[PDB]
Amino acid sequence: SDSDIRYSFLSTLDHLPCELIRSLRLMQTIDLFKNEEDEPGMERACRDLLLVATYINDLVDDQIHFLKQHKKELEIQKSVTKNFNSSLENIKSKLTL
Amino acid sequence: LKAELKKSLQDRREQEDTFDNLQQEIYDKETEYFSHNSNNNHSSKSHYSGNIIKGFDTFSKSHHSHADSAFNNNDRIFSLSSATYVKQQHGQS
Amino acid sequence: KLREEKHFQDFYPDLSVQTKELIFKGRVTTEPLVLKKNEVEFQKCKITTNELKGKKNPYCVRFNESFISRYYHINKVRNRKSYKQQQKEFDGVEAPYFTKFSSKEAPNITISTSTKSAIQKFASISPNLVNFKPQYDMDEQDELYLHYLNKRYFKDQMSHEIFEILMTTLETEWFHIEKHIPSTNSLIARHNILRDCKNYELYGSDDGTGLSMDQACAVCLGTDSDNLNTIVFCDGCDIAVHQECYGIIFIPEGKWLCRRCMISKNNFATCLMCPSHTGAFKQTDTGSWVHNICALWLPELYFSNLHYMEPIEGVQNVSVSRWKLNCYICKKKMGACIQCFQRNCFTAYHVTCARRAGLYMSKGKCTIQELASNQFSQKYSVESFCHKHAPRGWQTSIEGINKARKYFSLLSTLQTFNKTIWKTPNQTPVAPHVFAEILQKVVDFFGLANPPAGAFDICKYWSMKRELTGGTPLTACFENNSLGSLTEEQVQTRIDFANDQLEDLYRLKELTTLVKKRTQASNSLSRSRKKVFDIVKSPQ
Amino acid sequence: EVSEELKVRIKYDSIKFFNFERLISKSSVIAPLVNKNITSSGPLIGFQRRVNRLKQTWDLATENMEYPYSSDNTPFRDNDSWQWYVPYGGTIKKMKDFSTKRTLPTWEDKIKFLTFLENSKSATYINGNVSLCNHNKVWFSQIEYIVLRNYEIKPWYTSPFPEHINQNKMVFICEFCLKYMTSRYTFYRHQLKCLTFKPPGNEIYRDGKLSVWEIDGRENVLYCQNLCLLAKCFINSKTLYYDVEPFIFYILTEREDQNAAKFHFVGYFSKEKFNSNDYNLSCILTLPIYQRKGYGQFLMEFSYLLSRKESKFGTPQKPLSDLGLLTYRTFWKIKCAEVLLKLRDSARRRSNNKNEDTFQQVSLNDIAKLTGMIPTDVVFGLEQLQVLYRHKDFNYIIKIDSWNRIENIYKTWSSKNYPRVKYDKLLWEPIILGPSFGINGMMNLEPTALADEDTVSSLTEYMCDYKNTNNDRLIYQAEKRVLESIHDRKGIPRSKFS
Amino acid sequence: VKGSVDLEKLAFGLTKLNEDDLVGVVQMVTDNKTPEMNVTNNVEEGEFIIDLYSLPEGLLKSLWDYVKKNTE
Ligand SMILES: CC(=O)SCCNC(=O)CCNC(=O)[C@H](O)C(C)(C)COP(=O)(O)OP(=O)(O)OC[C@H]1O[C@@H](n2cnc3c(N)ncnc32)[C@H](O)[C@@H]1OP(=O)(O)O
Ligand SMILES: [Zn+2]
Ligand SMILES: [Zn+2]
Numbered sequence A: 001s002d003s004d005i006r007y008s009f010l011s012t013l014d015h016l017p018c019e020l021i022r023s024l025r026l027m028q029t030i031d032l033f034k035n036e037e038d039e040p041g042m043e044r045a046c047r048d049l050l051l052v053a054t055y056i057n058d059l060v061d062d063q064i065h066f067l068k069q070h071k072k073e074l075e076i077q078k079s080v081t082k083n084f085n086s087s088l089e090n091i092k093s094k095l096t097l
Numbered sequence B: 001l002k003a004e005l006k007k008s009l010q011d012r013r014e015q016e017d018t019f020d021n022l023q024q025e026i027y028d029k030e031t032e033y034f035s036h037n038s039n040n041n042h043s044s045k046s047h048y049s050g051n052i053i054k055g056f057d058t059f060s061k062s063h064h065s066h067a068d069s070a071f072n073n074n075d076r077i078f079s080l081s082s083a084t085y086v087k088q089q090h091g092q093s
Numbered sequence C: 001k002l003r004e005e006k007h008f009q010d011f012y013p014d015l016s017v018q019t020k021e022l023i024f025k026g027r028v029t030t031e032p033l034v035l036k037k038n039e040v041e042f043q044k045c046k047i048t049t050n051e052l053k054g055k056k057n058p059y060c061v062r063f064n065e066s067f068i069s070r071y072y073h074i075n076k077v078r079n080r081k082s083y084k085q086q087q088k089e090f091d092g093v094e095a096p097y098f099t100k101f102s103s104k105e106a107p108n109i110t111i112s113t114s115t116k117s118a119i120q121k122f123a124s125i126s127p128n129l130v131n132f133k134p135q136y137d138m139d140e141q142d143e144l145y146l147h148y149l150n151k152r153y154f155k156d157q158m159s160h161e162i163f164e165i166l167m168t169t170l171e172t173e174w175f176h177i178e179k180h181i182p183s184t185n186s187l188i189a190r191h192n193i194l195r196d197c198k199n200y201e202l203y204g205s206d207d208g209t210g211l212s213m214d215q216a217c218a219v220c221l222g223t224d225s226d227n228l229n230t231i232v233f234c235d236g237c238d239i240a241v242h243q244e245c246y247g248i249i250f251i252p253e254g255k256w257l258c259r260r261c262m263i264s265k266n267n268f269a270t271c272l273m274c275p276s277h278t279g280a281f282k283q284t285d286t287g288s289w290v291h292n293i294c295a296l297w298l299p300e301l302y303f304s305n306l307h308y309m310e311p312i313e314g315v316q317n318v319s320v321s322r323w324k325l326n327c328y329i330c331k332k333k334m335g336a337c338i339q340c341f342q343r344n345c346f347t348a349y350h351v352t353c354a355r356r357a358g359l360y361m362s363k364g365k366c367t368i369q370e371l372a373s374n375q376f377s378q379k380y381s382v383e384s385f386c387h388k389h390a391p392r393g394w395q396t397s398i399e400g401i402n403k404a405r406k407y408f409s410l411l412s413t414l415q416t417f418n419k420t421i422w423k424t425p426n427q428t429p430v431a432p433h434v435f436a437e438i439l440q441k442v443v444d445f446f447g448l449a450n451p452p453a454g455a456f457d458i459c460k461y462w463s464m465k466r467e468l469t470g471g472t473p474l475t476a477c478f479e480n481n482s483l484g485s486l487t488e489e490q491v492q493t494r495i496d497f498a499n500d501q502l503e504d505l506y507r508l509k510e511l512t513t514l515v516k517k518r519t520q521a522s523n524s525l526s527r528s529r530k531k532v533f534d535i536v537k538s539p540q
Numbered sequence D: 001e002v003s004e005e006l007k008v009r010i011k012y013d014s015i016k017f018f019n020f021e022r023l024i025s026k027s028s029v030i031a032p033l034v035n036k037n038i039t040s041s042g043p044l045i046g047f048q049r050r051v052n053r054l055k056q057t058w059d060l061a062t063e064n065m066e067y068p069y070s071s072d073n074t075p076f077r078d079n080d081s082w083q084w085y086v087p088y089g090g091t092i093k094k095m096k097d098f099s100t101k102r103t104l105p106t107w108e109d110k111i112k113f114l115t116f117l118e119n120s121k122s123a124t125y126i127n128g129n130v131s132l133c134n135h136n137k138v139w140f141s142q143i144e145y146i147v148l149r150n151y152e153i154k155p156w157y158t159s160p161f162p163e164h165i166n167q168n169k170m171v172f173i174c175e176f177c178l179k180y181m182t183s184r185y186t187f188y189r190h191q192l193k194c195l196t197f198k199p200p201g202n203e204i205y206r207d208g209k210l211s212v213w214e215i216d217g218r219e220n221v222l223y224c225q226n227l228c229l230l231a232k233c234f235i236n237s238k239t240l241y242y243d244v245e246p247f248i249f250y251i252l253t254e255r256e257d258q259n260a261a262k263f264h265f266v267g268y269f270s271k272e273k274f275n276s277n278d279y280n281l282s283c284i285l286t287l288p289i290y291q292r293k294g295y296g297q298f299l300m301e302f303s304y305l306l307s308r309k310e311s312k313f314g315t316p317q318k319p320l321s322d323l324g325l326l327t328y329r330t331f332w333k334i335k336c337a338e339v340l341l342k343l344r345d346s347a348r349r350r351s352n353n354k355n356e357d358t359f360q361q362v363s364l365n366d367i368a369k370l371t372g373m374i375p376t377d378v379v380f381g382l383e384q385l386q387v388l389y390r391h392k393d394f395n396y397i398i399k400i401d402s403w404n405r406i407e408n409i410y411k412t413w414s415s416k417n418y419p420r421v422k423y424d425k426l427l428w429e430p431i432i433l434g435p436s437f438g439i440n441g442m443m444n445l446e447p448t449a450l451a452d453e454d455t456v457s458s459l460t461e462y463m464c465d466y467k468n469t470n471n472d473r474l475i476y477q478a479e480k481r482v483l484e485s486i487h488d489r490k491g492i493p494r495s496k497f498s
Numbered sequence E: 001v002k003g004s005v006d007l008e009k010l011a012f013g014l015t016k017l018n019e020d021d022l023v024g025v026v027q028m029v030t031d032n033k034t035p036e037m038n039v040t041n042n043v044e045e046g047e048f049i050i051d052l053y054s055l056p057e058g059l060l061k062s063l064w065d066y067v068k069k070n071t072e
């Protein structure tokens, strides 16, 4: 009897697509409404696009990092719980039941 | 200088070739990425079938169906993000 | 409500303070505006902090020292980049905007190969020391302890930075053991509930724990629950409260912690008005945790925001006559009290004392919101009753008041195969042998002359300082990560789902890389095309 | 020095009296010299309170203070609980590794600890509760200053800082990470380490020096809590201290010239992520060091720019303070004057030939679409400008007496040289909320009824909106549409009244 | 004159202390301060005015022992 796993990984199942689509929409807006007449505008839009690309890349990578760390901690916690139960099995007498 | 002119034109042609190749590769890769769904549900037995972007609670065993191979063209959220792509889309349709 | 907050007059949809109403209902008036100014609102001091700094440099060894100068900005003059060139590089269109992922190293200092090898060797000490940065702030009484250590053990070679680094090492190493403690299972749960039942039988309690096999509400003494306002359980302690009662409006996904366990630690504090240490505690507008029931029932105390039950305001406003009284059950001489409701009775008591004893308390028919409003102070009051003036059905609770007296007398008297105790009676840490081992390894890494007693001394000092603070961690780092109460198969399913999501994130990353490449290519194409197409139109 | 005649005078060299090493050295020898039976009973302030609490809980105390502290130990004060048999919850297994025989603090070396403590007293007091610049007590605070950049700001309203901070009378605060200590030595030691000189989050607008960073509410849960606690010292009614996830914080900083750039905090405003009340701003603040300089109006115009980019109508939270109302009035007045002047100047181009008989009437919705506020704010602005007339058919009519007065108002307000927003220097896009509304908390079958949701939305497309051109992304492009909507209409003749 | 300490001799012996001992005296007095005593401090200039007839006897004994120790 437990809730659905979808709500546990809320930082990867929900909050990543939000920001990814937001950033892509901003990039499309910039590219579409860039007007070719002004050299300063074009030069600015260049680095805007490049920056948004770098941002979305790093935003993707950070989640991989966090997820690897979480998996490691999970397996360690499983080992610890098993050892703790095995240990506490022997001290059944002290606990008054 | 016509020499500088042709020196610019050659690199221009190479650059537009690379750009078109990148566009096509992104297109096909995203098609495969959105279509890969059915293989895991049809063949451990990780019944979780469904992507992360378009995926919803079908990315959980609460649902069971085999129509997961349905996807339209308004979901190419990685190729839509360019101006040339949407202009060509609206031109051809 | 002032006039500048309103909607409209009669109709217009087509082609010095004034208040229209009163706060709720009234007529137009005026008020001279008070934008006060004390004429001394601020002043600028003359001497900076770095002006009155120390005079002697306590360092004598440089054995693998760049690890310090990497993280600490000791008073050295780096590459003097002219402010004009810094403005040129940080205020030009060539300078992009910043982001929360911009490499937090500034190009003014470039990391050398020796430095990176040193930090790698440091990280290799223990798996919990990767991604490490010093985080402790030396006090003004640690100076004497540093002097004593430097005179006795380390032959006058230890430095402030080394002391701080050791302290943060101990902190991190304890946190990574703290996070994994298994929370609960069936055996200890049964032991806890039986112990609490026996406790309530012996002395009685005010938190609601032990009335039956089920818990209750520490604020309203209720038992039911709905879907709009559930009954959430704290984890530091084991109290249970509802949302609209305790002012819960944000239910987190993992572990919920009461306000006390979040801000302070479970260290047994007391009300400013009631002599106890158990129940649901709320903050006042200064600190000074107060019982969320003492505050409700004391008249002059009232809440500020009726939705959050946040800072308990109006504490100094209570008169001096209340502090003259003294409860007749506990019979201490601290806090506030309330009199019996029946006339001609003048027997006061604290509210937690009244509850624990089991006198007659009744909220009547008003709601929690109306009672915390401070406007029901003018409406009919709540009804608390003395011992002898109890109403029908409620028996004489001399037994209960003697139970309360026995609990308090026991507390006062307590005031007056192989087992290794690992925490003080206040539930604060105690460093084990492995920590001393790590500390000796670190001292060896830095190159000082380490005797094996200095590590034990520093561990004792760390434990005693953490006992002095009260329970709050010295360093401020803390994460909501709570593995804890997870079972085994749950961890297994989590691992499986994590593997799937990671396999997906890989394809996502590849797609993103291709996107970036396309962007760069199109950019260069436009860059060249503009000149190649303007040169033909401009003969020049 | 001149002790003669019953009165003494001494000179300091304050730059030597306030030294650190000398303070500690002198306190070390002062502490034992003063008779240790020199004590009071009434006052219980931070240092002595902490020392007495520790002495009472260690039982190495002495009855000096008659006020009691009761809760000290658990009723089950027993050395046979099951905890001592399974050490450390089991996260260690080697027998010679959880052994705590060489590290238990001894009754012997608790006394050295207490000795260092009671020797550092004078140094602690001088470092904490003595101001550098020249200018029952447990219930109200004792703070008298706040040392933020290098100033000593006075507060206006108390704030729920922790107790050991509220018991002192100088709280030091770092202006780069918003952390608070209660000792100048501690502050120096911490500034020796804090190396990054930029707040978290990304920066979106940068003109000259002024910058505005955008900080989320769930990725930085410490910065935002400290910011709320600080701002509560000046704002009278702000009751969001701890749960700071649903909000989004925009922060204003000034950059100056280790020699790299440093971004000094100067002010902020906060915006709720999702709500259905046409709100635009929850709280705003500029530091007392530099106000009456334009930053408040800058932040207000920036917020309105964000709302118009989001294509809505906005207004601040209603319980307005006095010092804020006195600014919003002026802002509304100047905005209405500016939109009227721009309307005039635009009509002056194509109105070179037609007579004055044709009166082009406009409406509150047009003025709102042009500026950004809501109709009631527009009419308050017009009121402050003295242009509306409900003369004794049409009831209401705007009428200008002379075209010099309004441009005079505008030029005199402009001659102050305040900084203003430049539309093209922004890099932002309205936020999108998934099935969890951007937070990490409450989830049930209620948000689907609240939606006017089940895990079916997941921000499906949000990218095919280019096909329709009814909405306009460029504000200076939608303004021409709003300007040509009702201004080609056949104008009313002027012969109605004279 | 009053108490176990003669204020005249105390003030006289106060004169022979050097500057560091003077700063120490100022710090000792500034630490423990009561509403009755009349002490005035000026931090920019560096002035410190104090009247012995206002101080209590505890600080008087403390100053007596301090100067007695540090004079020789
Ligand atoms: C709930 C909500 O949404 S709003 C709550 C806001 N209330 C508070 O923040 C309380 C503390 N208040 C503040 O910190 C700040 O004052 C603010 C943001 C309100 C505005 O202060 P400022 O930075 O100085 O605004 P600003 O630069 O533009 O002031 C310019 C003009 O505003 C008006 N005005 C502003 N302050 C004053 C003032 N103290 N007295 C008289 N008029 C003032 C004047 O027109 C003033 O012009 P002036 O220079 O001729 O006097
Ligand atoms: Zn309740
Ligand atoms: Zn709790």
Ligand SMILES: [Zn+2]
Pocket: C327, C328, C329, C330, C331, C332, C349, C350, C353
């Ligand atoms: Zn009592």
Ligand SMILES: [Zn+2]
Pocket: D174, D175, D176, D177, D178, D179, D190, D191, D194
């Ligand atoms: Zn800092």
